[PDB]
Amino acid sequence: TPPVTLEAARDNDFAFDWQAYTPPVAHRLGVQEVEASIETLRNYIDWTPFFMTWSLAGKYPRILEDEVVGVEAQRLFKDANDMLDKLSAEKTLNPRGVVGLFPANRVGDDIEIYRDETRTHVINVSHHLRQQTEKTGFANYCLADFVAPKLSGKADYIGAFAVTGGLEEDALADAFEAQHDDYNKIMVKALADRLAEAFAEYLHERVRKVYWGYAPNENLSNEELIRENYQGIRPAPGYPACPEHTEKATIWELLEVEKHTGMKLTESFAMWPGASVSGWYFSHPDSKYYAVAQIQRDQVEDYARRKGMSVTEVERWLAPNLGYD
Ligand SMILES: C[S@@+](CC[C@H](N)C(=O)[O-])C[C@H]1O[C@@H](n2cnc3c(N)ncnc32)[C@H](O)[C@@H]1O
């Protein structure tokens, strides 16, 4: 579909009656360091991507009873759970995280994050991009649209998180590598990945039910969590609704991630440990995932101004989303 101007895209933002809506108030404002044991997180693992890493097709648990691949899948699952048992008993891989909730309001394509409920001084801005092609029967979506506009006067909130399977991932993998034990190197990295993703799932549930507290009586099974049968989203910088990786620096500052977890950002804004997830929390019932996709020079230049970057810098960080040479 052909591109639209930045102004035309913004004129087609997500349409919602903010005057009639009361955004749920975050129960626990502030930043809290968290941990979770392997024993806790293993009940939140989604095993299907684990088998994909091992090049096996099928959804868990049915894959275990498969007539062609089930026997190999059962051995992988047994070895994985034997390793989880050992890591758990020996405390050699320790998942850690941090969560924060803040007063927030939308201004334009950005979300202002306030020091306090006076909603005056801004401690950080979460910057977002907007879909920029012709939409038929849908808004030109921007994640900022799911937070009440400052002009509406409605008290709204935003969350953020960072979690890891554990800082020990590299030391455990590097030991297997030194032994030329490629099977167990792959296994421990795959388990750290499952633990990080399980922590992101568990912590999101904690936020919906307790920290934000808008769904205190939610009672979903793990299969229902995997199907995303809850209200709200947890979009992560680098993924299609917020592809720009440098926004992880804002999460790192907002949550003091390195102080609270030991997790670090690289010069490419990749996370360390490898088995890590970071992102935002949105409570709005209509919030959803989508792809920003290709954007034009007008939006690139505007994003650069908002970010305090040159156009040249932004063209590096937005290279995959540029709809022009
Ligand atoms: C990567 S899966 C994680 C849970 C899944 N059961 C698993 O283990 O792989 C889904 C997560 O990716 C992120 N995500 C997926 N699509 C996205 C999009 N279009 N924009 C932003 N984040 C997205 C969100 O953080 C979402 O919770």
Curated annotation (Swiss-Prot):
Residues 1-325 form the AdoMet activation domain. One of its GO terms (biological process) is homocysteine metabolic process. S-adenosyl-L-methionine binds at D46, R234, Y289, Y290. One of its GO terms (cellular component) is cytoplasm. Keywords: Amino-acid biosynthesis, Cobalamin, Cobalt, Metal-binding, Methionine biosynthesis, Methyltransferase, Repeat, S-adenosyl-L-methionine, Transferase, Zinc. The keyword Zinc applies. It comes from the Bacteria. GO terms for molecular function: cobalamin binding; methionine synthase activity; zinc ion binding. Belongs to the vitamin-B12 dependent methionine synthase family. L-homocysteine is bound via the zinc atom. Modular enzyme with four functionally distinct domains. The isolated Hcy-binding domain catalyzes methyl transfer from free methylcobalamin to homocysteine. The Hcy-binding domain in association with the pterin-binding domain catalyzes the methylation of cob(I)alamin by methyltetrahydrofolate and the methylation of homocysteine. The B12-binding domain binds the cofactor. The AdoMet activation domain binds S-adenosyl-L-methionine. Under aerobic conditions cob(I)alamin can be converted to inactive cob(II)alamin. Catalyzes the transfer of a methyl group from methyl-cobalamin to homocysteine, yielding enzyme-bound cob(I)alamin and methionine. Subsequently, remethylates the cofactor using methyltetrahydrofolate. This is Methionine synthase. It comes from Escherichia coli (strain K12). The lineage of its organism: Bacteria, Pseudomonadati, Pseudomonadota, Gammaproteobacteria, Enterobacterales. The gene is metH.
